[PDB]
Amino acid sequence: DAEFRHDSGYEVHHQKLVFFAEDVGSNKGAIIGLMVGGVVIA
């Protein structure tokens, strides 16, 4: 055991970050709730 095991748990977020951001990004029309929710403060 060295780095053969810890592949998925490395790759996950590396991709989940892109994937999730895609999911949100190409659905701003929906996630708009949060967008507005974040505009009211800050």
Side-chain angles (χ1 to χ4, degrees):
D1 290 349
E3 47 179 323
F4 303 100
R5 281 292 212 77
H6 294 261
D7 172 46
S8 44
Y10 180 69
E11 292 282 80
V12 53
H13 290 107
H14 283 203
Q15 195 187 242
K16 128 77 88 184
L17 279 163
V18 172
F19 167 75
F20 204 77
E22 253 282 305
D23 189 274
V24 172
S26 308
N27 198 17
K28 268 197 131 186
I31 283 73
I32 248 179
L34 116 60
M35 213 72 235
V36 175
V39 160
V40 57
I41 317 107

